[PDB]
Amino acid sequence: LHKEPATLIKAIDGDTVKLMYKGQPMTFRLLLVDTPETKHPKKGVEKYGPEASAFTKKMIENAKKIEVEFDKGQRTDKYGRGLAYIYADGKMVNEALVRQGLAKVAYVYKPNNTHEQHLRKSEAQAKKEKLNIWS
């Protein structure tokens, strides 16, 4: 796998961000994680949704360098969103959310699961620490 540079356009939700990638605006879905929603297809504004969304936003808005890392499977979902690991100054946003108990590890689909174990370890620690989602 390898990291490419992107530029923030707009943060949309805890799990979705708009980036400029290779010259074009693109919506990215964060791989392997489910955050609570502020714009949920059915519910609405779920609990910890606003805090997951401010965390993604702050972490990416305050970065010097954003990079996108695709996995080895398909790179877009059926809504045309890019599927990627996102890095703010070298720190994976997907893992930061899970480590903080602001996201769960999602239902996984091979072969888009390279960082699955790593994230699952972070979720286990957030759980043991009773953070946010887990309190």
From Swiss-Prot:
Q: Where does Ca(2+) bind?
A: D15, D34, T35
In which domain of life is the source organism classified? Bacteria
Residue ranges of the region described as Disordered: 115-135
Localization, UniProt: Secreted
- Catalytic machinery residues: R29, E37, R81
Biased composition of type Basic and acidic residues is found at: 115-131
Q: Which residues cross the membrane?
A: none
**What is the protein name given in its UniProt record?**
Nuclease A
Question: Where does this protein come from, organism-wise?
Answer: Staphylococcus aureus
Which part of the full protein is shown?
89 to 223 of 231
